[PDB]
Each structure stands twice: as C-alpha cells, then as structure tokens.
C-alpha cells in the first residue's frame, strides 16, 4: 500500500462537531505517518494509552478510528479512560481498556468570537451515563423534577443541551480546544493500517 492516511481530512477540517454529536472517521488500507502529528507544534496534549508516541510509526493495526469534536480546556482531562464529568458521562466516554491516543489543541483564534460563540453545544443533563463510544443526539426535554415535562421547557424541565459561549478573552480552561481521539483496533485479522515500513 502506497496509500497515505487522510489525516488532513480530520485535523484540518475547518468545521468541527459539537462534543455531543462527535464525528467518527474510519481509517483503513493506508500507511499512517504519525510523525506528521507528533512533530506539529500545535498539540498541547498527546496522551497515548497501551501505546507510545515513539512506537507509533513501528506499529500495525487492523483499523484506526478518528473521533473529533470541540470542548472547554478544563475538559481535555476528561477525554481519558476512567474519568467522570459532564463530558465523560454525558457526551463522550472512553472505555477502561481503550487503546489509542488523545490529541488536543487550542482553537481560540478559530472557535471564539467577541460576544461569545454559542454554536458549540454539550449535553448538560442525562438520565444516566453514556456507555463507551455511545453517541446521544436526542433533544428530549429532561425531567429534573417530579412533574412530567411533555416536551415543554420550563421549571425543572430543561433542554438537555447547553452552549459554551467561547469568547477570546476567557482563561484557557474556558477556551475552545479541538480534540481528535485515535482508536487503534487490533483483531485476529490482517492489518490494514501500518506506519512507514
């Protein structure tokens, strides 16, 4: 395979998804140059699990899965196995046995505008925590109280999604970060994604 993995399509997307409606890109039948990623002076975060950034280009996998979205800075720590918080519980959950890398970069200059950018949403309320890689996009009014809501917003009856309102003057923990999770799948099957041999 001379096919080069279309990382560009993911990292340089221009449009990025809200965390609640996170995107997935399947990556198969190409050679992956992880060098392009770990050499970039953009990534404030590069946490790898069951695998090492150095080791990446010398490793072979069945498939790779790139999940991408936007969150607050303070929430970058939650995109990890065995975490809790509004994001890990209600938006995007990694499993305990997760194999892959979590890469994040500050996108204040892109995803912030004066007066606040209210486009990026997250789920604030859910009846229960997400199972790993579950993706909930429903907008059922959430029953906080004892009264049934009947799909009407009001007291104790909240719309489950909230805006971030990223403004450029915020502290980093409240600035937007773009996140890409690379999942490395390893089945008892021939590998389709390898580093430069």
């Amino acid at each position: 395979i001379t096919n080069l993995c279309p990382f560009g399509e993911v990292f340089n997307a221009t449009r990025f998804a809200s965390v609640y409606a996170w995107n997935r890109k399947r990556i198969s039948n190409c050679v992956a140059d992880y060098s392009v990623l770990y050499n970039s002076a953009s990534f404030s975060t590069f946490k790898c699990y069951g695998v090492s950034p150095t080791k990446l280009n010398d490793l072979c996998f069945t498939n790779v899965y790139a999940d991408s979205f936007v969150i607050r800075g303070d929430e970058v720590r939650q995109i990890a196995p065995g975490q809790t918080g509004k994001i890990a519980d209600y938006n995007y959950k990694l499993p305990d046995d997760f194999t892959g890398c979590v890469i994040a970069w500050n996108s204040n200059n892109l995803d912030s505008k004066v007066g606040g950018n209210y486009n990026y949403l997250y789920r604030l309320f859910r009846k229960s925590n997400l199972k790993p890689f579950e993706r909930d996009i429903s907008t059922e009014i959430y029953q906080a109280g004892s009264t049934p809501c009947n799909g009407v917003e009001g007291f104790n009856c909240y719309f489950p999604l909230q805006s971030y309102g990223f403004q450029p003057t915020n502290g980093v923990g409240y600035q937007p970060y773009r996140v890409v999770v690379l999942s490395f799948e390893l089945l008892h099957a021939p590998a389709t994604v390898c580093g430069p041999k």
Partner: antibody, heavy 120, light 112 residues
Framework: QVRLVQSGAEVKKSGESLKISCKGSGYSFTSYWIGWVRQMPGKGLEWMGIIYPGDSDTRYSPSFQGQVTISADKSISTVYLQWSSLKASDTAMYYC?????????????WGQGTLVTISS | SVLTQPASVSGSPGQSITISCTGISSDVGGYNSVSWYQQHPGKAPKLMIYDVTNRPSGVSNRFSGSKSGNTASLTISGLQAEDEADYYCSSYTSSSTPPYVFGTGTKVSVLG
C-alpha cells in the same frame, strides 16, 4: 485471551425454574455487551438480547421480551439467563457471545453452549 | 427485518457454491455490519466473514462475501469435506429493534 465459559448441560421438567450462566475471562468484563442466542433442535439461530454488565442495562429482542430475564454480576464476571416456568418449547442450546471489539460489532467470541432439555 | 437464505445447497469436492441472503435493511444514521457464520454439529458458530467482505485470520481463503442492495452472498470456492456445515447470514443495525438478526440458515452438503 477472551473466553466465555457457560454452565453445564441442564435436564429439567416443565414448570421448573432455571438459571444458566456465562462467565467471561481475559478482558474488561464491564466494558462490553454480552448477547444470548437460542438454537432449538435442528432449527436456526435466534438473537435473544444483550446485557451491559457494568450497569445491568438490557435490550431484549421483541420475541424474548417478557419470556426470559437477563441478569449480571459484575463481581464474578458472570451473566445469567433466567426462567420462572420452563415450557417444553424452551428445549434448546443456548449461547452467550460478545462483539469482536468496541468497533467491530460481529459476534466473534462465543461460549461453548448450554443444552437445555425440557421433558414434558 | 428477516433475512432469507436457501434451506440447503450442495456441491462436490472442488466446486464453488453460493449461499444467498435476502432482506437486509440499513441505517446510515448508525453503524451497520453483515456477517457470515459457520456451525458444525454440536458446536458454536464460527465467524467466517465480518464487515460484509472482510475475513478473519485462520479462516481459509476460498470463502468470500459480497452484497447487492438487500442481498448478501457467500461463496465457498473449491469445496472441501470440512466445509459441510450450516451457514448463517447475520446483520447488525445499532438503531434497530432488534439490533441483531440471524438469517434462516443453509445446510451445505459436500457430496461424498
């Protein structure tokens, strides 16, 4: 290495209780759905339903909804299949099975099967 | 909804047979997968074809998968005695109830 070990063969009579089991080793037991499949003698495979044992969340097939109960026990890595009152038509081989990965949904991992013979 | 296979097919050693499988729906909104399983008497089914076409390690060549609209197809090329088994079609749809459906089943006879 992922393995599902099921309880031995059961020979019962109509009206009796039955609980058959499936214990999983070699992986994070609470991080994956487990599925039950029924095979009546000489007949095909039927998907009964799944349980997520870290949570005890269940999805039943409309066919088996209300005729069997699927239960979990985090601590002993076991997943159960439960009847109150066995019919003769419950005579079958039962399989617990699991996805290949978090990303590959096809049942690659299977139990050995438990044979349930209901004499009437 | 329900996947239909022929009750049985047969061939002699060396021949190629084709099991069809009909009635597969799908949703682009969620994940999907079409798998083939092989079951020898008194044994648990073995995955032969996953993700429509893809094949596990340890599963011989000879076996291949394909799909046309709503019809999946398995082809055992160059039949061998050990191929005599029941073969099951299977579909997953994350947002269906039920999510998982097995096909009606096909007995393969290798004429001795």
């Amino acid at each position: 290495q992922v393995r599902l070990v099921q309880s031995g063969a059961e020979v019962k009579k109509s009206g009796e209780s039955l609980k058959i089991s499936c214990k999983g080793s070699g992986y994070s037991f609470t991080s994956y759905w487990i599925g039950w499949v029924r095979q009546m003698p000489g007949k095909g495979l039927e998907w009964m339903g799944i349980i997520y044992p870290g949570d005890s969340d269940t999805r039943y097939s409309p066919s088996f909804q209300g005729q069997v109960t699927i239960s979990a026990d985090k601590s002993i890595s076991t997943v159960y299949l439960q009847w109150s009152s066995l019919k003769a038509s419950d005579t079958a081989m039962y399989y617990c099975a699991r996805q290949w990965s978090h990303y590959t949904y096809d049942y690659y991992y299977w139990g050995q099967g438990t044979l349930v013979t209901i004499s009437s | 909804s329900v996947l239909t296979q022929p009750a049985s097919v047969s061939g002699s050693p060396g021949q190629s047979i084709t099991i069809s499988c009909t009635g597969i729906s799908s949703d682009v909104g969620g994940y999907n997968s079409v798998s083939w399983y092989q079951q020898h008497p008194g044994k648990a089914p073995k995955l032969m074809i996953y993700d429509v076409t893809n094949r596990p390690s340890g599963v011989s060549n000879r076996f291949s998968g394909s799909k046309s609209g709503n019809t999946a197809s398995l082809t055992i090329s160059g039949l061998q005695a050990e191929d005599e088994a029941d073969y099951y079609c299977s579909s997953y749809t994350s947002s269906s109830t039920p999510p998982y459906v097995f096909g009606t089943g096909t007995k393969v006879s290798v004429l001795g």
